Coordinates of C-alpha atoms in Angstrom, one line a residue:
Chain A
X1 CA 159.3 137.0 -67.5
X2 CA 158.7 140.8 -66.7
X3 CA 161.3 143.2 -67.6
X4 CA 163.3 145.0 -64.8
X5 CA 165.4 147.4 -66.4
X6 CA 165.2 145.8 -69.8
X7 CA 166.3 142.2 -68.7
X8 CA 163.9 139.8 -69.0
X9 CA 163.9 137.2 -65.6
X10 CA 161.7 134.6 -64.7
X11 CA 160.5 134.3 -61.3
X12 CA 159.3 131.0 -61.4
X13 CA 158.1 129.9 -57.7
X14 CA 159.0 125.9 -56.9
X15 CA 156.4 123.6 -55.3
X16 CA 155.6 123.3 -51.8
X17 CA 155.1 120.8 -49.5
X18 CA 154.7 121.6 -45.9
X19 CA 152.3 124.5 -45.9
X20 CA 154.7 127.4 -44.8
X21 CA 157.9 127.3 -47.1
X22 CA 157.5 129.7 -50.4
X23 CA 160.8 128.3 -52.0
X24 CA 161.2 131.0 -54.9
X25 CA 164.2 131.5 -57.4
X26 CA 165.4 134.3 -60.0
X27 CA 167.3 134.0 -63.2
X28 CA 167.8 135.7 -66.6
X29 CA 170.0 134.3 -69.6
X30 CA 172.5 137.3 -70.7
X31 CA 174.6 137.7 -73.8
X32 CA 176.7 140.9 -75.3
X33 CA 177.5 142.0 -78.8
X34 CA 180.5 144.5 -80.5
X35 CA 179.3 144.6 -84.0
X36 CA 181.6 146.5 -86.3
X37 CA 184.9 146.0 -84.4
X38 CA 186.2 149.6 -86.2
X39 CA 185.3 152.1 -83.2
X40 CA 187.1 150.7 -80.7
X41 CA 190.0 151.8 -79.1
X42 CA 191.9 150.4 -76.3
X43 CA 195.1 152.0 -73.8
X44 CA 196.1 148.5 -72.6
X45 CA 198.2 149.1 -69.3
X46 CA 198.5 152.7 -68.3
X47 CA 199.8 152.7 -64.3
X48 CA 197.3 151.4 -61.5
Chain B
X1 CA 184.9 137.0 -80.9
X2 CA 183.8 135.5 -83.5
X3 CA 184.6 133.1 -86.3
X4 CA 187.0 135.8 -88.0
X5 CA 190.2 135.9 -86.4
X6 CA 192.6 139.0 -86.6
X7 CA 195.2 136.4 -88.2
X8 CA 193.8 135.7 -91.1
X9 CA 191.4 138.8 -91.9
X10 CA 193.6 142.1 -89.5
X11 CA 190.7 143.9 -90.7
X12 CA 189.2 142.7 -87.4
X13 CA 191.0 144.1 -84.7
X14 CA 190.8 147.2 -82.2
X15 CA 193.4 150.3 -82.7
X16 CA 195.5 149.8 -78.8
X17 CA 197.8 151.3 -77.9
X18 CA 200.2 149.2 -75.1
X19 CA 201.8 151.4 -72.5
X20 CA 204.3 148.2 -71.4
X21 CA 207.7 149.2 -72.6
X22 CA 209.8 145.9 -73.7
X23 CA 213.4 147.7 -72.3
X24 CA 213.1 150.4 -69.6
X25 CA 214.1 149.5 -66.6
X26 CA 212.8 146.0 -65.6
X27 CA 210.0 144.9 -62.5
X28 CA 207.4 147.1 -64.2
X29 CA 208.6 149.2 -66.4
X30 CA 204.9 150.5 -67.1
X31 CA 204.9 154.1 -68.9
X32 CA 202.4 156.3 -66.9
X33 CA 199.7 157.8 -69.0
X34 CA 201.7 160.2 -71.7
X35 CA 199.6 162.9 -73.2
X36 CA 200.4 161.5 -76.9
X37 CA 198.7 158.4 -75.9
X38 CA 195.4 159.7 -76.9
X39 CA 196.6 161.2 -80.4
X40 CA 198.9 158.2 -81.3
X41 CA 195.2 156.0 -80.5
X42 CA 193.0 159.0 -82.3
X43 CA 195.4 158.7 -85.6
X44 CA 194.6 154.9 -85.6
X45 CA 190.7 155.2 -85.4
X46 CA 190.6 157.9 -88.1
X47 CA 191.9 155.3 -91.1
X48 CA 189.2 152.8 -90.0
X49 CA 186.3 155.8 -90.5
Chain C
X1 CA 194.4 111.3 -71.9
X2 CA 192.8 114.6 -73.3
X3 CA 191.5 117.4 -72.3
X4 CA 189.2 119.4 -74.9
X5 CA 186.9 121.6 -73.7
X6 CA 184.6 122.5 -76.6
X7 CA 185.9 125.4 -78.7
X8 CA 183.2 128.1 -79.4
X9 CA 183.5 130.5 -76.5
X10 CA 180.2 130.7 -75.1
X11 CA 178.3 127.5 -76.2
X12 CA 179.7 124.7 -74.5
X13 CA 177.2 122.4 -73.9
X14 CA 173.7 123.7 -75.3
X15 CA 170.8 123.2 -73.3
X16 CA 168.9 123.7 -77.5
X17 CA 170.6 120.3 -78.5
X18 CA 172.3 121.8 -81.8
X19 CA 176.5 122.8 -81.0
X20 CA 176.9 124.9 -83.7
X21 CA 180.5 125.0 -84.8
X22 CA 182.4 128.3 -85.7
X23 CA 183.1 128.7 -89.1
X24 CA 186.4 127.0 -90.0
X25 CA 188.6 128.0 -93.0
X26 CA 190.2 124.8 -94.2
X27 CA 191.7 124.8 -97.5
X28 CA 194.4 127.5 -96.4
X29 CA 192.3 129.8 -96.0
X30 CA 190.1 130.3 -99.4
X31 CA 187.0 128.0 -98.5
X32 CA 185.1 127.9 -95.3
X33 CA 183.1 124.9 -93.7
X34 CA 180.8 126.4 -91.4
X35 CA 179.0 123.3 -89.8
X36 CA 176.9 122.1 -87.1
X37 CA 177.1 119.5 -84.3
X38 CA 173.6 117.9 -83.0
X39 CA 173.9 115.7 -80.0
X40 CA 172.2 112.8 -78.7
X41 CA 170.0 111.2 -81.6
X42 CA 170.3 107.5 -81.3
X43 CA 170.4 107.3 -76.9
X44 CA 173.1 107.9 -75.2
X45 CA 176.4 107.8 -74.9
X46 CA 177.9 105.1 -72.9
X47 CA 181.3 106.7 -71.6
X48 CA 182.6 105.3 -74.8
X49 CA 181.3 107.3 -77.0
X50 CA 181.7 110.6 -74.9
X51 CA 185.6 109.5 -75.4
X52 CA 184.6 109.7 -79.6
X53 CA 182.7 112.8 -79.8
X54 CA 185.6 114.1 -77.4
X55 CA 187.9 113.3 -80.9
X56 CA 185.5 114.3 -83.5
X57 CA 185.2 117.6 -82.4
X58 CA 189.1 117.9 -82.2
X59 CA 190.3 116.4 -85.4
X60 CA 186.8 119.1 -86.8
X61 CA 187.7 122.6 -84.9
X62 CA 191.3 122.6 -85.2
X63 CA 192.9 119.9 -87.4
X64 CA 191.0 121.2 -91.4
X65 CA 192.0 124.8 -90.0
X66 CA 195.8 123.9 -89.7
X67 CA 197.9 123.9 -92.7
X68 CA 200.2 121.2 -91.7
X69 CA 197.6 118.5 -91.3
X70 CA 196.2 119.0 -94.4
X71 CA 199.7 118.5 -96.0
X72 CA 200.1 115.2 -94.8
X73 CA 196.6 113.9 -95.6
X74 CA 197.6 115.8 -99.1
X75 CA 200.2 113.2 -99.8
X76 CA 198.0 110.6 -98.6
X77 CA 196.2 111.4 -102.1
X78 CA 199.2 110.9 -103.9
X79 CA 200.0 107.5 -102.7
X80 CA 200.6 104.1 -105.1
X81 CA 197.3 102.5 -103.7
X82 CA 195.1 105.1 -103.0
X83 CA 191.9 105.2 -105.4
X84 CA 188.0 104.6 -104.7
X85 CA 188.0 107.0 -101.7
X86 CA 187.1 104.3 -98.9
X87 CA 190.5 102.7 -99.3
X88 CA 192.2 106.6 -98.7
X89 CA 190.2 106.0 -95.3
X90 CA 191.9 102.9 -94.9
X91 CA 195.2 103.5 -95.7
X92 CA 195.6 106.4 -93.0
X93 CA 194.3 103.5 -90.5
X94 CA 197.4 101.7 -91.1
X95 CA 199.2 105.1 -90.8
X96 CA 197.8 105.7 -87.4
X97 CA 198.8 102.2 -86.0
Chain D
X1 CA 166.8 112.6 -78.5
X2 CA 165.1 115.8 -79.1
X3 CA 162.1 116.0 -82.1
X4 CA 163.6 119.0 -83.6
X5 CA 167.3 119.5 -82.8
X6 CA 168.2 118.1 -86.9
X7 CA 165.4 120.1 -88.3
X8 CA 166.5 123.8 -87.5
X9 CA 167.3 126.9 -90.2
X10 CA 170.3 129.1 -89.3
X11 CA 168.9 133.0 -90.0
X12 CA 170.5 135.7 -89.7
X13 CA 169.7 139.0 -88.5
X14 CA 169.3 142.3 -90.9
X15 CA 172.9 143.5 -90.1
X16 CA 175.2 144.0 -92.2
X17 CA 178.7 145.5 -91.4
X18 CA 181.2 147.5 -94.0
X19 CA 184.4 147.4 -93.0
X20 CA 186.5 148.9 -95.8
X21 CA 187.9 151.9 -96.2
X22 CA 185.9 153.3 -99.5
X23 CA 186.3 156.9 -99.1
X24 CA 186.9 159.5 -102.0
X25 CA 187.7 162.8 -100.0
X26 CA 190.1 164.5 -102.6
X27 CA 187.7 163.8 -105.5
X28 CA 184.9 165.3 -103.1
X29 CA 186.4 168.9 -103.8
X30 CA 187.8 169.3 -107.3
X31 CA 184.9 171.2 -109.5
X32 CA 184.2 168.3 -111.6
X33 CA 183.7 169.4 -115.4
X34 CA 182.4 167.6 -118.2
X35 CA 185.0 167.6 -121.0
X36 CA 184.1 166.2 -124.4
X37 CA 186.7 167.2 -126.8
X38 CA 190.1 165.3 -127.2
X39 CA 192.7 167.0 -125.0
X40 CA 192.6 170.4 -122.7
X41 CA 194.4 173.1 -124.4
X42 CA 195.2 176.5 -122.4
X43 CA 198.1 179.1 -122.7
X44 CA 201.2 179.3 -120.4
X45 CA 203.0 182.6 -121.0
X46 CA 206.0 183.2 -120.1
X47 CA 209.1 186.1 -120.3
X48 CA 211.2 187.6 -123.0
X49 CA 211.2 191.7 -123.1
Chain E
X1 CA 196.4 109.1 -106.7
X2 CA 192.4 109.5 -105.3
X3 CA 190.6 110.2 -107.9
X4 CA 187.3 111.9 -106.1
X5 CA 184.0 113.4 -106.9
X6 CA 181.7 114.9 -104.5
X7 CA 179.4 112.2 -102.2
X8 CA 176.0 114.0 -102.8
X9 CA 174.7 112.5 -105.5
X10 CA 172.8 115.4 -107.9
X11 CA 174.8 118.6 -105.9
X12 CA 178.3 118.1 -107.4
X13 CA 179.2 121.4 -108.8
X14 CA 176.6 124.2 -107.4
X15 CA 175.5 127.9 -108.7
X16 CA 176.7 129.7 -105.9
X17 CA 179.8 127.2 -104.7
X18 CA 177.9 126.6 -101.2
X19 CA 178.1 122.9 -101.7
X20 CA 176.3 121.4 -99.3
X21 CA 177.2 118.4 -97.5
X22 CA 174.1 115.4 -96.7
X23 CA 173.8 114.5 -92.8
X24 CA 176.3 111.4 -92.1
X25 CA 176.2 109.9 -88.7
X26 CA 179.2 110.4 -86.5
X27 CA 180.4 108.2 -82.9
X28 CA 178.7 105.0 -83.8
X29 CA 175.4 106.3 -85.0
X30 CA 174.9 108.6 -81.7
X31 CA 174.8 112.2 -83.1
X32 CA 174.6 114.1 -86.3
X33 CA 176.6 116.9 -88.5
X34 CA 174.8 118.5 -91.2
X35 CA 177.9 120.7 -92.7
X36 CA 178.0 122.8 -95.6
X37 CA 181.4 123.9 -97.3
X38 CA 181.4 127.2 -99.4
X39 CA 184.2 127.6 -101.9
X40 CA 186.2 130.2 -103.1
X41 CA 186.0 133.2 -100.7
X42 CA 189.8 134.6 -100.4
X43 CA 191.0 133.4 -104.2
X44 CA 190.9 130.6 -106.3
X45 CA 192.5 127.7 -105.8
X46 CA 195.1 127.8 -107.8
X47 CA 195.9 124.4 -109.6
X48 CA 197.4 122.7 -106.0
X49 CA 194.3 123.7 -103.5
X50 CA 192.2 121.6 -105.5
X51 CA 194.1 118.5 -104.4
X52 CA 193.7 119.6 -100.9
X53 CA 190.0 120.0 -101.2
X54 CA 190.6 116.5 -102.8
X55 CA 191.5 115.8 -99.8
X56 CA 189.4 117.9 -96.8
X57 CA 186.1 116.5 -98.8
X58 CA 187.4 113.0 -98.5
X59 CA 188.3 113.0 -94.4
X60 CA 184.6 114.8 -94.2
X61 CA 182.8 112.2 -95.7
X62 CA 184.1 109.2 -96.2
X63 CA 186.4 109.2 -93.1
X64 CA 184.2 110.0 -89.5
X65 CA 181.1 108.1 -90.9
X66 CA 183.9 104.9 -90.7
X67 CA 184.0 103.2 -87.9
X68 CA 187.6 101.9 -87.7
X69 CA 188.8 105.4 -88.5
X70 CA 186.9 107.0 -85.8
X71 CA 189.0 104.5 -83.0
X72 CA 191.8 104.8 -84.7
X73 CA 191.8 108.8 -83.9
X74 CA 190.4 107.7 -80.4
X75 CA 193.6 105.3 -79.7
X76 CA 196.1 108.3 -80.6
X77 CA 193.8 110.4 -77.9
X78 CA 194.8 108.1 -74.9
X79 CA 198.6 108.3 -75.1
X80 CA 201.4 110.4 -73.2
X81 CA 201.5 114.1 -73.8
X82 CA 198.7 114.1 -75.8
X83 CA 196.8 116.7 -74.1
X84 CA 196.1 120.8 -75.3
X85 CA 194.1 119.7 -78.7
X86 CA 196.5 122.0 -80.6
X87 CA 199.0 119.3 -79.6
X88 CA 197.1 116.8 -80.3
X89 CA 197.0 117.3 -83.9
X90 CA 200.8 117.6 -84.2
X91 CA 201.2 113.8 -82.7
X92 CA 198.4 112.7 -85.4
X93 CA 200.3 114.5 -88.3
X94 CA 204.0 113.2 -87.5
X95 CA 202.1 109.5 -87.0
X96 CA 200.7 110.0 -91.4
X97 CA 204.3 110.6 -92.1

């Protein structure tokens, strides 16, 4: 898995059968973190 | 977010700062953006350093 | 019927084999549990035993965590008959039919 | 059935997060001064001519 | 009244209070837990809390090994408005009444 924009993705070509058909795919497997929930500060609602 | 919950432990939660007033007028009440917003939010975040 | 979903926000059903629980805290809230959940270790399950580890996990991530439950299986304990700790097992069976 | 779904070690990561207020900004500016004897003595003068 | 000690047979009363639970096998041999449970973190436990970890020790152990218990909290599972687990519990703790 290379890594486009610091997001590692497979590419991960499937198997052919007919001689012409290059079935490919793309994927990456995410997750986000908020250590030290102290800094943050919301406005909930404001108007639109 | 996690396995603390801001019942138990409220020293896991954000400072906010909800512009949804419970008596106004009714169908959406929805204060608009008052300046003291952003100093009633900054007093919260400077007791949490 | 019943309709858990597993609990932990983003790790439903783990492709690694190990559900890791969230960390419960069980004895109103001055202890903590922090377990584990592996799957699949003897087979399979046979539509039986989806309906039972659709229970474990329920009576596990949110009845220790209340503080009613544990009241009731508190005077459970303090019952005329109730010694040996496989016959406190048994004497909630006949509570729960 | 997998080999080594029992057999794993929760690690944690080098992070470690303080979330407690343990600040000392008053005693940060007072000209601390070491003492030794048994109680401070000064003068206070007041009126009277 | 249950008189109880802990089910690991050398780990009773640790150093550090992580008292770590042994691996018992849950839905009819299927699947495994491997738990831990760490003691006093927000207190002590204050001369009643240690009947109710009497009592959280004893459904952990000797309870969802069982095999009778483990249908008998699959039976209250299948009924009428038992559905939303946090409602599920409060139909399993007004049945241990």
């Amino acid at each position: 898995a290379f890594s486009a924009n610091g997001v590692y993705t497979l590419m991960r070509q499937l198997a052919q059968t007919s001689l012409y058909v290059d079935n490919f795919v793309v994927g990456c497997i995410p997750q986000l973190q908020l250590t030290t929930r102290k800094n943050v500060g919301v406005i909930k609602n404001i108007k639109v | 977010y996690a396995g603390i919950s801001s019942a138990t432990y409220p020293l896991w939660n954000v400072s906010e700062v909800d512009a949804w007033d419970a008596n106004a007028t009714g169908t959406d009440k929805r204060q608009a953006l008052k300046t003291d917003f952003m100093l009633e939010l900054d007093r919260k975040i400077r007791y949490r350093p | 019927p019943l309709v858990y979903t597993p609990a932990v926000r983003g790790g439903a059903n783990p492709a690694s084999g190990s559900y890791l629980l969230d960390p419960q805290y069980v004895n109103s809230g001055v202890d903590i549990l922090q377990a584990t959940y592996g799957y699949n270790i003897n087979g399979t399950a046979n539509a039986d035993q989806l309906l039972q580890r659709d229970a474990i996990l329920a009576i596990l991530e949110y009845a220790l965590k209340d503080t009613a439950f544990v009241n009731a299986i508190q005077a459970v304990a303090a019952g005329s008959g109730v010694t040996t700790p496989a016959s406190f097992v048994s004497a909630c069976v006949t509570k729960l039919t | 059935a997998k080999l080594n779904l029992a057999v794993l070690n929760n690690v944690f990561s080098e992070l470690l997060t303080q979330e407690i207020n343990r600040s000392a900004t008053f005693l940060g500016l007072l000209s601390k001064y070491p003492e030794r004897k048994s109680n401070i003595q000064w003068g206070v003068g007041m009126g009277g001519t």
